[PDB]
Symmetry: C5
Subunit: 204 residues, 5 copies
């Protein structure tokens, strides 16, 4: 694994091929999770931030930016959407959690909680995923779409198999995240495919 | 009866069936009242915040958000509306009072008094209500309308059979409400129907 | 008379009949005057703030809000209009003075002087007026127009038979007006006609 | 001469006749100058601020406001224009300088330098002007145009036969102008024609 | 060489001829560079800020302002574009760096980093350039276009044959740049062609 503290992936151009694969040994279906990361893009079209597909299942867990001020989460191909006041262009810190028992999904944008939504109560997110940054998967690992590609910078990505309490979400926003057991930016296993460059983070 | 201090009802999806019934023993018609609560929604269409119907009488006491910055109160099916500068989306704290003797209705939004309006001077709000959060009633307890449903979070709801002076309204807004004899968040008798989840309040 | 310190007139609904008559001991034509008051309304259409008519003479002295940010003064049926940056809805403190010798009219909005205009140099405003709040007169005392009615709250009204220097205007704005010899809120003679309610001032 | 310290000319109405003539025994052609003054108008159409014509020469030196945020200088009938962020309506302090040697024209608006422009390098502004406030001259002293008339207040007008450095512009802006040898508000020779009233300056 | 500390080039008018040539002894192809300068213009159409062409190669290194809030860099006739929130008109400090090994291009606008883009990975910028301010070259030293001309002021220009770290970019922004080996405002070799005037910098 590699410690990417203080660094970002730069997806420096639009394409249907540039991407990063994130590797996790996740074998157990997820009942709960929290996912946090920081991103900086000047795209105004929609784009995928985090794409997690499993065999036979598109949009099994997907974080997708619809337009300025509007974020969607998909769980098992069902979607919820939440709104927020934001500037454009601007760096953003995004957390999202989901809890099967209640179905509640919660976005936090720059440490501010969005209105809670709910979906897929009782569902388990399937395991053995392919996880992709920079492109949105329609297949198990592929079938990308140029108009959903992420162009810009991503970093500080963590994913936990629990629902973090607010204090721990704020800690992540402030730059001291709890160590994470699904994905952890400070101990990350990844594969760059195509034109993706690792650079220091200069915009926090 | 349940103490919901520090908690909210989450109506996590749009529907024509998800709702909470609030039970009060109120039997004497009301000359005066004050109603306070906090809400957080990213709907921009109109929606009902607090729906109180009596037998044979639609919109007997209704707090209805027309659009961003515009709030209506119905008394006995007659309406007044007042405007305020506000951000969107954003949590809101709302108090509203009405006094039969003068007919005066006063909204307070995030501690700001709106322009006073007046209606139903001399009227008495009927008692033995059905009170619903999450949907707007057109019947005694039912006949909901998807396009009036409330999607989002509501908490800290109190209702008194008198007009609170401004200092007591600010106390509610600050988080130190007087005890309340019609509805009280710290001793609430409620019935969840459909998809409504109780969660901690994280947005005040 | 009546001491309305700390209180406002509330015109709680649109109508063509609700109004207040103000009674002045004014037997002499006016060469100079200053008029100050506070108002709070969420109307965006035009409306009359202060209507003073004499026999055979419509708009003999009239303060009329044309639209957000635009105020007009009529003297002997002639009009001037001045603009200002303001928020909507918002309480406002308005002073207006006029003097025959120069014809100069000056509005002050929330203690800010508007651009001076001029009209009716050499003219004397006629005596023996009917003075009305809540409606715009077209006759001596009447002939109202619903689309010119004032809905909202008015308080702290004073009128002097001289042109106040700026430091006295600012004293009025801050809540310490000099004693006033035409109309005085602390010693006011008035009649309520229709639906007008007196309430405490809560927005200053 | 007259000392107008603390006072303004008020042009209280739109007309094609109201104006002030400024008198200066300017007998030698001008190679360099700076002109400063304060103005307050809520016109949104174009208008002349300072009109200097010589025999057979229209727009020999003219300061003209095109629209909110846009100011023009004419030298010998040729024009430059520069833009600025400004509020409307609002008082403004305006300085403009021009230098034959380089042709450079500087506007300063509320103490802020606009982008430099250039025109008429090597030219001499003709002597023996008629100088008018309130109207734009097309002839030697006349041929006004109602739609270019200045309605509002003008004060603190100074004109120097040199290009003032920045600190001298700050000095004028803050109400402490350097002594001036072409026109000086504290020793001004002027002629009022029509409806122009001298009043105290209350908006600084 | 000339020390232009505290001075700017003023391009006082639109034209297809006014320009400055910048002379550098650059003989080896450039792998990496940083370019910083300050500019002030009230043009809203597109314009060239810095035009570097080599024999037979248009837009070999070009910094081009597309519209308010949008900056482009060309390397070997390929383009990237980044967006920023900015006021108009307003002075600006611009740095841009590019590195062949990664292809990464980074704009800094008033010390704020824009989203990184990438182009021309592995390419070397050709040497023996003609470098022009005030006009956009389509040939080696010429073939200008009036609608791409720069009207306004430019100063404090430095170019280095390395990618400056962030703290050094802030140094340049604040007025204490590192000495620079390709172009240096304190030791600049330049030629004025047409109407370009050197004046003190008054807008920092
Ligand atoms: C909801 O809410 C509501 C509201 O809030 C409520 O209600 C309320 O309530 C409350 C409580 O209850 C109340 O209070 C009260 O008050 C009162 C007053 O009133 C008033 O005010 C108020 C205020 O707010 C109000 O509200 C009311 O309403 C009123 O007001 C008014 O109204 C009216 C109507 O009616 C109106 O009308 C008028 O006016 C009009 C108009 O005007 C005008 C105009 O505008 O325009 C003006 C102007 O200037 C003019 N101008 C010229 C130029 O002129 C004009 C003209 O004129 C025309 O226009 C033409 O041109 O005009 C007209 O004017 C007409 O005409 C008139 O009429 C009016 O306006 C109004 N005003 C105002 C100001 O606004 C009071 O009074 C009361 O009192 C009390 O107080 C306290 C508190 O502070 C209490 O607590 C208590 O009660 C008290 O006390 C007392 O004392 C007394 C005395 O001092 C007494 O008496 C005594 O007694 C004694 C003893 O006894 C004996 C005998 O008998 O003798 C002894 C022996 O020994 C023994 N024996 C043995 C063997 O032992 C015996 C035995 O015991 C016995 O008998 C028994 O059996 O005893 C002796 O007698 C001695 O002598 C005496 O003195 C008493 O008793 C006591 N009491 C008690 C109980 O204690 C109170 O305060 C209120 O009122 C109400 N309100 C209503 C509305 O309702 C409710 O409640 C709620 N709900 C629920 C359910 O909760
Ligand atoms: C341009 O920058 C590149 C990248 O920083 C420089 O290449 C590096 O050179 C150093 C030592 O000279 C090595 O440690 C790196 O591994 C090199 N990186 C790569 C990708 O080649 C390069 O030297 C710079 N060029 C010039 C002319 O200074
Ligand atoms: O791409 C996805 O998997 C989902 C998740 C993000 C948004 N999205 C969709 O909008 C579903 C469809 C994406 C592709 C698309 O826009 N179209 C339009 C017609 C053909 C094709 C399709 O739906 O299959
Ligand atoms: O729903 C209510 O009881 C009141 C209170 C909130 C707003 N409202 C209304 O707008 C009244 C009518 C709502 C339903 C509606 O829009 N229509 C349109 C035609 C049929 C139906 C109706 O009025 O019955
Ligand atoms: O009402 C007044 O006395 C004055 C003062 C306020 C504006 N106004 C006007 O006259 C403006 C026009 C308002 C509408 C109106 O009164 N109309 C429109 C046509 C018939 C009737 C009229 O002018 O008599
Ligand atoms: O009035 C001036 O001397 C100059 C200076 C300010 C603007 N202007 C212009 O000439 C602009 C055009 C204004 C309108 C005008 O004067 N017109 C319009 C056509 C006939 C007449 C003319 O140019 O002579
Ligand atoms: O001028 C350049 O070299 C490049 C760099 C800056 C922007 N630009 C262009 O937009 C290329 C086109 C410039 C000239 C132009 O707009 N046209 C339009 C048709 C003919 C002519 C051309 O492309 O040759
Ligand atoms: C290098 C050197 N440049 C100088 C040029 C050139 O001598 C001529 O432009 C060549 O024709 O002359 C200047 O007057 C100028 O252009 O501003 C001064 C400048 O320092
Ligand atoms: C999911 O998180 C919540 C929080 O307590 C709870 O429903 C459950 O225990 C968690 N599930 C698992 C399997 O860890
Ligand atoms: C009005 O003010 C003028 C100008 O100062 C003054 O001459 C006159 O006395 C005033 N009128 C009255 C009635 O006092
Ligand atoms: C105008 O300024 C120029 C350039 O600074 C100077 O040389 C000239 O003497 C000035 N003209 C006069 C008449 O003062």
């Amino acid at each position: 694994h590699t410690d990417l503290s203080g660094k970002v992936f730069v997806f420096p151009r639009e394409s249907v091929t540039d991407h990063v694969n994130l590797i996790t040994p996740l074998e157990k279906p997820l009942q709960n999770f929290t996912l946090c990361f920081r991103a900086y893009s000047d795209l105004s079209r929609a784009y995928s931030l985090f794409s997690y597909n499993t065999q036979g299942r598109d949009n099994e867990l997907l974080v997708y930016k619809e337009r300025v001020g509007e974020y969607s989460l998909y769980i098992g191909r069902h979607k919820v959407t939440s709104k927020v006041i934001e500037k454009f262009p601007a760096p953003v810190h995004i957390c999202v959690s989901w809890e099967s028992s209640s179905g509640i999904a919660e976005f936090w944008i720059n440490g501010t909680p969005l209105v809670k939504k709910g979906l897929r109560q009782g569902y388990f997110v399937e395991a053995q995923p392919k996880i992709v940054l920079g492109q949105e998967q329609d297949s198990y690992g592929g079938k990308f779409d140029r108009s959903q590609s992420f162009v810009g910078e991503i970093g500080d990505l963590y994913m936990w198999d629990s629902v973090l309490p607010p204090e721990n979400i704020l800690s992540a926003y402030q730059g001291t995240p709890l160590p994470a057991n699904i994905l952890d930016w400070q101990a990350l296993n990844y594969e760059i495919r195509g034109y993706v460059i690792i650079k220091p983070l200069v915009w926090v």
